[PDB]
Amino acid sequence: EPFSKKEWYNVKVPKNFKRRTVGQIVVNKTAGTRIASEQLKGRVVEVNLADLMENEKFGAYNYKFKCEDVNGKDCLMIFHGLKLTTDKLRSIVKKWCTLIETSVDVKTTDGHLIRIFCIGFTSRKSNQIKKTSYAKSAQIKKIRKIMNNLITKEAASRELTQFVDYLRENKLPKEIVAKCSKVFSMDNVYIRKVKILKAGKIDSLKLLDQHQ
């Protein structure tokens, strides 16, 4: 029997989310020199945002977490990254517009080095009659420069935990559209992916503050 040596651990996300438990993961029982709590020190868990916040309006994003230490049958997950759902990313790429992309390496105030990817699209106006809405190379560079600089200021002041919660608020995509509409009519602005280029140092006290 394969599952005779298997035991399940409860998965606990940090307190920033409405839902605290997201599921159970499996691991073989302890052995000679194979400690189960050691073999769970790097597992990565992909969780939708809709489940975390218990609202289906947040279903466009997928979040990722990493098990750092075992608190007696419990992992204490930490935020590993985020990524747009595949169906949403391909549904926002219209044809007769201009696609604008960017990426910034931002050093969060608490020491995390992260890479943030932003995507945007030129839109059609209310009275517009012509089929195509393209932007010159000059307007595109202005727009990318605006969203490069504006996203850096928002993420450089706040630490990683609060910045991710700041992403849940639609202020940044709304601010970018409002600021970039002075250069060209923009409608769709999303932050499609965030990585962790260099993990900032963390302490068991810091994890405790992040877990109740």
Binding site: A50, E56, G59, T85, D87, K88, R90, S91
Partner: protein
């Protein structure tokens, strides 16, 4: 001689365009000469959409679709009935 004024392409004051690979036979065709079609379909067929809904774990989950762009060579587009052979006078219609 010239069956088409545009030679069957979409080429103009360019004069070299990159290749794209056919979706069926894997042939190399130029980007403008390729027969481009767009597909937007749900990942659940119309038979199983009811069956998926009945035993689900989400209250108001909206079924996502799949979007992909298919490019066919002339040989692999005519055989697959993507485009048909038209009349001599009906060839000129671009609608």
């Amino acid at each position: 001689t010239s069956k088409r004024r545009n030679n069957g392409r979409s080429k103009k004051g360019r004069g070299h365009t990159q290749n794209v690979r056919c979706s069926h036979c894997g042939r190399c065709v130029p980007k403008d000469k390729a027969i481009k079609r767009y597909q937007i379909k749900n990942i659940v067929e119309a038979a199983a959409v009811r069956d998926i809904s009945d035993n689900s774990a989400l209250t108001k989950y909206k079924l996502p679709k799949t979007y992909m762009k298919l490019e066919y060579c002339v040989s692999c587009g005519i055989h697959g009935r993507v485009v048909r052979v038209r009349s001599r006078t009906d060839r000129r219609n671009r609608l």
